[PDB]
Amino acid sequence: SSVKISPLKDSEAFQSIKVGNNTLQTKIVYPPTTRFRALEDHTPSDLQLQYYGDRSTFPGTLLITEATFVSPQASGWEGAAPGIWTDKHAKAWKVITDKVHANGSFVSTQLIFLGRVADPAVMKTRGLNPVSASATYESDAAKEAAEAVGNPVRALTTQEVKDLVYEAYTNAAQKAMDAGFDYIELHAAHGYLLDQFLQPCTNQRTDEYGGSIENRARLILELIDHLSTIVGADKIGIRISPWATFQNMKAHKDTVHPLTTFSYLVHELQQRADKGQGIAYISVVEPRVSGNVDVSEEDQAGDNEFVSKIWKGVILKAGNYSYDAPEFKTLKEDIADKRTLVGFSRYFTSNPNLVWKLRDGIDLVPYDRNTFYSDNNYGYNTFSMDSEEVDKELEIKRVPSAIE
Amino acid sequence: SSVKISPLKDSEAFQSIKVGNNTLQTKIVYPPTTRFRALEDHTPSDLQLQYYGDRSTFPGTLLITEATFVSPQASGWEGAAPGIWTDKHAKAWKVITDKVHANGSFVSTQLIFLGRVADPAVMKTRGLNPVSASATYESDAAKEAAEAVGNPVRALTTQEVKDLVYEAYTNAAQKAMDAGFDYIELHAAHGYLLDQFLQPCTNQRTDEYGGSIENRARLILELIDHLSTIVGADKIGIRISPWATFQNMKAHKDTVHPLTTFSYLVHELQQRADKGQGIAYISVVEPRVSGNVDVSEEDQAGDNEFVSKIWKGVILKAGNYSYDAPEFKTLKEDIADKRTLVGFSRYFTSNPNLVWKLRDGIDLVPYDRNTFYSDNNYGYNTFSMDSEEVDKELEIKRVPSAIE
Numbered sequence: 001s002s003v004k005i006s007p008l009k010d011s012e013a014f015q016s017i018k019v020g021n022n023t024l025q026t027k028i029v030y031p032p033t034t035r036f037r038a039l040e041d042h043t044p045s046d047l048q049l050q051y052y053g054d055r056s057t058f059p060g061t062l063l064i065t066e067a068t069f070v071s072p073q074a075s076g077w078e079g080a081a082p083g084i085w086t087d088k089h090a091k092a093w094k095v096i097t098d099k100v101h102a103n104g105s106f107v108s109t110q111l112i113f114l115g116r117v118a119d120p121a122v123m124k125t126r127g128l129n130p131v132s133a134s135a136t137y138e139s140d141a142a143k144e145a146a147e148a149v150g151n152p153v154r155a156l157t158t159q160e161v162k163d164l165v166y167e168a169y170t171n172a173a174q175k176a177m178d179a180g181f182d183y184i185e186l187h188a189a190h191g192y193l194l195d196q197f198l199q200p201c202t203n204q205r206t207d208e209y210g211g212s213i214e215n216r217a218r219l220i221l222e223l224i225d226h227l228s229t230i231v232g233a234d235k236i237g238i239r240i241s242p243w244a245t246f247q248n249m250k251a252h253k254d255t256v257h258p259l260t261t262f263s264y265l266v267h268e269l270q271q272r273a274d275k276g277q278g279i280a281y282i283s284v285v286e287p288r289v290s291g292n293v294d295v296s297e298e299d300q301a302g303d304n305e306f307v308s309k310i311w312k313g314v315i316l317k318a319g320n321y322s323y324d325a326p327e328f329k330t331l332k333e334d335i336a337d338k339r340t341l342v343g344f345s346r347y348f349t350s351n352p353n354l355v356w357k358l359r360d361g362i363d364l365v366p367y368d369r370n371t372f373y374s375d376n377n378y379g380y381n382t383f384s385m386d387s388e389e390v391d392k393e394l395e396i397k398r399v400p401s402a403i404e
Numbered sequence: 405s406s407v408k409i410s411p412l413k414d415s416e417a418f419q420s421i422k423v424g425n426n427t428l429q430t431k432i433v434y435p436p437t438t439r440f441r442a443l444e445d446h447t448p449s450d451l452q453l454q455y456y457g458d459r460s461t462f463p464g465t466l467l468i469t470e471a472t473f474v475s476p477q478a479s480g481w482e483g484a485a486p487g488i489w490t491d492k493h494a495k496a497w498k499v500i501t502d503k504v505h506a507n508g509s510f511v512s513t514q515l516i517f518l519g520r521v522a523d524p525a526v527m528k529t530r531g532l533n534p535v536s537a538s539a540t541y542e543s544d545a546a547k548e549a550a551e552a553v554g555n556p557v558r559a560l561t562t563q564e565v566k567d568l569v570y571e572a573y574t575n576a577a578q579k580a581m582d583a584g585f586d587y588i589e590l591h592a593a594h595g596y597l598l599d600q601f602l603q604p605c606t607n608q609r610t611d612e613y614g615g616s617i618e619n620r621a622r623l624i625l626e627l628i629d630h631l632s633t634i635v636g637a638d639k640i641g642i643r644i645s646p647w648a649t650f651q652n653m654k655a656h657k658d659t660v661h662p663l664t665t666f667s668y669l670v671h672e673l674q675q676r677a678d679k680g681q682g683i684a685y686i687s688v689v690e691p692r693v694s695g696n697v698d699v700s701e702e703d704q705a706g707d708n709e710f711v712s713k714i715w716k717g718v719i720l721k722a723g724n725y726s727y728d729a730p731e732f733k734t735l736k737e738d739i740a741d742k743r744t745l746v747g748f749s750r751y752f753t754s755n756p757n758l759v760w761k762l763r764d765g766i767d768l769v770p771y772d773r774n775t776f777y778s779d780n781n782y783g784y785n786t787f788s789m790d791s792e793e794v795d796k797e798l799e800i801k802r803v804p805s806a807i808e
């Protein structure tokens with residue numbers, strides 16, 4: 001069912017806010033949203049071009065791309081997600097960042113590393129293992145599945161870690177800059193690699209990257225400091241989901257509480273800002289939400305309020321913000337401080353002009369969870385056409401080709 | 405000026421709540437409140453007898469005594485505060501816990517260790533140093549003052565620490581049990597010893613009691629675990645002031661944020677509770693307040709809300725709860741969860757029958773900050789008489805004698 005909504009045009013959501021060196025004209029953001037419409041070889045496609053161009057028509061909007069791989073070792077998905085380690089990649093993404101820029105908008109890229117939840121069948125085809133902070137499995141099934149193909153998860157060595165910072169991520173930060181990205185965002189949420197490293201249930205390392213709160217955070221901060229000196233702090237973002245239990249993160253039930261784990265981290269980030277090295281934004285994930293799925297009113301067990309008392313800079317919040325629609329009481333409270341942005345993912349998928357719709361209170365077209373993760377244009381770029389010209393076949397046949 | 409207030413009789417504040425093995429009949433608590441009306445040799449007096457008896461007339465009230473010394477080394481004050489290390493002490497406190505008990509009320513004792521803020525002139529007269537986690541001074545004055553008498557603050561050795569746990573505090577937990585106390589509360593706030601140990605601005609130790617978040621907390625937790633096995637978890641309380649800057653604690657401006665420092669600690673305490681070793685209550689200090697003095701609306705920079713999302717047991721809050729009087733909107737919100745108690749200190753000083761006054765909305769007699777810390781009965785037990793029989797002289801002459 002469609003969602004009736006009131007206008008946000010006169011709210012703080014259309015007041016300008018400086019994020020790094022760029023000024024957005026709306027505080028409404030498209031957060032990183034995986035869609036598996038990249039080409040086979042992990043390169044951006046003619047579909048992604050239209051799909052990102054489509055959503056940048058409100059001048060000065062900030063778009064954040066789907067999780068993108070930093071390297072072959074960082075992948076692990078059965079679907080076609082994009083990468084940004086080769087020149088092939090970058091030059092293609094370039095065509096897209098140009099498109100968004102020509103519309104006065106901005107675009108940040110989320111850098112992801114799967115780690116302990118990589119599909120062992122696929123890593124095998126790259127002559128790779130599944131890796132992680134320690135050698136753990138999401139589920140009991142995910143561990144057997146891995147062994148069956150003879151490709152168990154192995155823990156990175158103190159050396160392979162350093163190479164992530166100075167070879168793996170560095171290369172991608174640079175291909176990103178070559179690609180035209182206005183920011184890059186370290187995906188430190190949803191129980192992927194960096195989240196794996198941050199929290200005790202997935203990180204029982206004995207070296208300097210494990211063993212204490214400080215150690216566990218050690219790696220994330222090394223990427224921040226080093227990448228700050230390659231792209232500049234003003235182009236670095238990070239995402240966190242303190243409360244999510246996606247891919248089996250213990251969250252509030254771990255041996256160290258997320259408040260403890262993430263205040264430490266956030267407050268370290270603030271100290272850097274104090275010395276003039278503040279990153280652009282901290283992207284957090286509201287407790288209503290966990291990964292790509294809602295959390296029920298009864299299981300929410302915290303908030304991200306602590307982030308606001310510790311970090312003085314820009315915050316990006318997302319997660320089912322139309323729950324108290326059509327008035328948006330909650331969203332308006334969250335943006336009251338005038339340094340907070342608000343993310344709309346799923347409703348962005350089916351509302352290419354979402355920023356416009358929210359501005360003028362136009363009813364939100366519902367989203368097709370069925371076509372989130374499929375491999376064709378059906379349920380992807382269709383929402384931009386007039387519904388009565390959509391040819392469900394022709395469009396299901398339409399897979400990602402190449403650009404130009 | 406007097407404070408007009410509405411009745412709390414029908415609120416959750418007069419619903420029974422189980423705290424350890426005792427059930428209170430009111431949630432309104434007298435928090436630890438230093439008054440310096442003990443005898444010269446740190447033994448309880450005929451004045452303290454009347455003063456604590458006076459406030460226990462509502463059956464099932466919980467009273468918490470003024471900070472009490474655990475040993476000669478733990479003192480450091482120019483005024484006459486009580487101790488609980490000798491038998492002399494205990495037998496005297498006994499006369500008092502009996503009095504409160506005969507009134508169906510309960511009484512916990514706050515165990516304090518001054519540390520780095522001991523007056524070096526007085527420690528000298530015991531042939532002692534000022535001690536601490538590290539060798540630091542509150543102020544630049546407090547360091548010079550100390551040297552002038554040739555008694556600088558020295559850092560405890562790894563050994564002296566162990567002795568606090570197994571000799572210093574153990575002895576006092578036992579003299580406490582001998583004394584009739586229903587609980588004992590570890591004073592881990594206001595920048596005294598345990599707070600000194602918990603936080604980085606006062607703890608740069610290189611052993612196991614410093615160097616990490618975990619290490620810094622190590623000592624507090626060792627006292628919890630060990631004292632749990634001597635008095636039982638159900639008789640242990642701890643107080644924290646996450647945000648106070650009393651005696652120069654950096655609070656939100658330290659190298660580790662209080663949220664980080666105290667979530668860790670509180671969540672460790674919860675894990676013990678999960679194994680059946682939960683202490684009786686966590687006493688926190690609301691950001692409106694810092695030590696014995698108010699904090700202005702502009703400098704409050706956090707809340708203790710994180711404590712409630714982490715600890716599942718009884719919480720005791722205090723700190724200027726009549727700010728939104730006469731309705732008490734805030735107090736009623738804070739007790740809504742039905743496991744929270746509310747502390748009234750200063751208004752308890754001049755309202756011996758405070759519990760009764762709050763129950764029936766009777767106007768609160770104002771307090772005399774001038775006579776908080778003086779050495780006679782004037783401004784102490786006077787508030788229990790009819791004001792027009794008070795003889796300001798006779799009562800200023802009246803100093804602490806002995807009991808019976």
Ligand SMILES: Cc1cc2nc3c(=O)[nH]c(=O)nc-3n(C[C@H](O)[C@H](O)[C@H](O)COP(=O)(O)O)c2cc1C
Pocket residue numbers: 031032033034035066067110187189190239285289291292293318319320321343344345346347372373
């Ligand atoms: C299909 C789908 C793909 C997603 N992909 C990502 C992703 O790659 N990275 C990420 O950080 N979050 C991802 N999310 C989570 C969203 O960014 C966001 O946290 C969540 O949708 C809450 O906002 P919303 O309810 O307004 O979409 C995804 C969510 C969905 C539904």
Ligand SMILES: Cc1cc2nc3c(=O)[nH]c(=O)nc-3n(C[C@H](O)[C@H](O)[C@H](O)COP(=O)(O)O)c2cc1C
Pocket residue numbers: 435436437438439470471514591593594643689693695696697722723724725747748749750751776777
């Ligand atoms: C004179 C005086 C003495 C105090 N002594 C202590 C003490 O020994 N230990 C302690 O933890 N807090 C002490 N406090 C702080 C109070 O317990 C409490 O945190 C503060 O008064 C806020 O509550 P109130 O404003 O209702 O009194 C003292 C406060 C005052 C005014």
